[PDB]
Amino acid sequence: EIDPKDLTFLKELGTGQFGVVKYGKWRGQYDVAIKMIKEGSMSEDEFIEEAKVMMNLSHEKLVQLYGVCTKQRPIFIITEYMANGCLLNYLREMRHRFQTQQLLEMCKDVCEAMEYLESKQFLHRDLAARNCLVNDQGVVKVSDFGLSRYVLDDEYTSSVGSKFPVRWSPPEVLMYSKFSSKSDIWAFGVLMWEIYSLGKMPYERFTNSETAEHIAQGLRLYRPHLASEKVYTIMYSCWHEKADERPTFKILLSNILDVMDEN
Ligand SMILES: CN1CCn2nc(Nc3cc(-c4cccc(NC(=O)c5cc6ccccc6s5)c4CO)n[nH]c3=O)cc2C1
């Protein structure tokens, strides 16, 4: 529990699934992001009840959840500030500057974080470039892991809602809501595709339902121009129709390192 008196609000950072987020400082020194949880937007009992485990996830490549303020309303969630914002806009805005080696390093950053979550049997559930953040040195970190579990918004929680991450979801999630490590694996493959396409939208011009139909018929995202064959083999392995044929993040990390070694 963070003492809200130790927080200094400084700047608006926009809005997310739980409402307003601000930039501020903790005890005058540490840059933080502060979510102000819109009333009615979150399953608050469930979150507070299970919030300890989320604070104890600690890894360089995870956006740290520093703590919470729950003695007043709205509740606050206080997290590690990342000066370059979310990965999707960072890709699109710096599109013409990236070398392929840097793209691979971004995939490695994310894969390390997910290997850690995997080892803790903790699911992200909404992995995507929009839910990765980039710090002032260009390091990518995975953000908002596990929070989808607390979203109260039928458009987000229903597989046919307008906000559900259909384009990051494997068949068993779209058909049966079967989340597992292997559905995070699928989403990581799509995230690699976002990185190597420099921030394009997956299945652009397809609706969500057409996307679902597409992928249920075996069809997959094309290889982006900047992805080598080896890289594409790695992201494609994430999209096996059968979940148990998909790799683990440990294997994916080994693959990425192997490609780095070869280069
Ligand atoms: C000039 N730029 C302006 C944008 N800009 N942004 C920066 N940096 C951060 C943004 C956020 C942030 C802000 C608003 C919303 C959200 N996203 C969410 O709240 C949620 C995502 C999800 C996903 C699934 C389930 C529930 C939720 S709730 C975040 C990231 O958490 N945070 N931290 C940061 O450092 C730095 C900049 C400079």
Ligand 1 centroid to Cα of residue 237, in Å, is 29
Cα distances from 75 to residues 14, 64, 78, in angstroms, run 17, 18, 10
Ligand 1 centroid to Cα of residue 113, in Å, is 18
Tell me the C-alpha distance between 149 and 130, whole Å: 17
Phi–psi pair at 119, nearest 5 degrees: -65, -20
Instruction: Mark whether 126 is an active-site residue.
Output: yes
Pocket test for ligand 1, best of 143, 150, 157, 164 (most atoms within 8 A of CB): 143
Tell me the C-alpha distance between 171 and 225, whole Å: 26
Q: Cβ contacts of residue 44 below 8 Å, gap of 6+?
A: 37, 75, 150
| Contact residues of ligand 1, CB 6 A cut-off | 13-14, 16-18, 21, 33, 35, 79, 81-83, 85, 126, 131, 133, 143-144, 147-148, 151
Pocket test for ligand 1, best of 34, 47, 62, 144 (most atoms within 8 A of CB): 144
Side chain identity, residue 260: M
Tell me the C-alpha distance between 223 and 233, whole Å: 9
Strand 30-37 and strand 140-142: pairing?
unpaired
Ligand 1 centroid to Cα of residue 135, in Å, is 12
Q: Which CATH class is domain 1-81?
A: alpha beta
How was this structure obtained? X-ray
Tell me if 227 sits within 8 A of 235, measured CB to CB.
yes
Cα distances from 115 to residues 62, 149, 160, 186, 188, in angstroms, run 11, 20, 29, 14, 11
From 6, 31, 45, 126, the catalytic residue:
126
Q: Cβ contacts of residue 139 below 8 Å, gap of 6+?
A: 60, 61, 109
Nearest CA to ligand 1 atom 5: 85
Preceding omega of 165 cis (within 30 degrees of 0):
no
- CATH architecture of the domain formed by 82-263: Orthogonal Bundle (1.10)
Ligand 1 centroid to Cα of residue 244, in Å, is 33
Tell me the C-alpha distance between 123 and 201, whole Å: 23
Cα distances from 44 to residues 35, 74, 75, 146, in angstroms, run 13, 10, 9, 14
Tell me if 155 sits within 8 A of 163, measured CB to CB.
yes
For residue 235 the two structure tokens come to: 């992201």
Tell me the C-alpha distance between 198 and 229, whole Å: 17
Q: Cβ contacts of residue 242 below 8 Å, gap of 6+?
A: none
Tell me the C-alpha distance between 158 and 165, whole Å: 10
* CA-atom Rg of the chain in angstroms: 18
List 11's β-bridge partners, or say none.
Answer: 23
Given this chain, do its domains 1-81 and 82-263 carry the same CATH topology? no
Tell me the C-alpha distance between 161 and 102, whole Å: 35
Ligand 1 centroid to Cα of residue 86, in Å, is 7
Tell me if 57 sits within 8 A of 120, measured CB to CB.
yes
Nearest CA to ligand 1 atom 17: 16
Side chain identity, residue 224: P
Instruction: Give the ligand 1 atom nearest the CA of 82.
Output: 35
Q: Would you put residue 146 in left (φ > 0), alpha (ψ -120 to 50) or beta?
A: left
Instruction: Give the ligand 1 atom nearest the CA of 79.
Output: 33
3-state secondary structure the chain: CCCHHHEEEEEEEEEECCEEEEEEEECCCEEEEEEEECCCCECHHHHHHCHHHHHHCCCCCECCEEEEECCCCCCEEEEECCCCCEHHHHHHHCHHHCCHHHHHHHHHHHHHHHHHHHHCCCCCCCCCHHHEEECCCCCEEECCCCHHHHECCHHHHCCCCCCCCHHHCCHHHHHHCCCCHHHHHHHHHHHHHHHHCCCCCCCCCCCHHHHHHHHHCCCCCCCCCCCCHHHHHHHHHCCCCCHHHCCCHHHHHHHHHHHHHHC
Nearest CA to ligand 1 atom 19: 16
Nearest CA to ligand 1 atom 27: 17
Q: How many CB atoms lie within 10 A of CB 9?
A: 12
For residue 172 the two structure tokens come to: 């068993």
Nearest CA to ligand 1 atom 37: 85
Tell me if 38 sits within 8 A of 107, measured CB to CB.
no
Tell me if 107 sits within 8 A of 59, measured CB to CB.
no
- Per-domain residue ranges of the chain: 1-81, 82-263
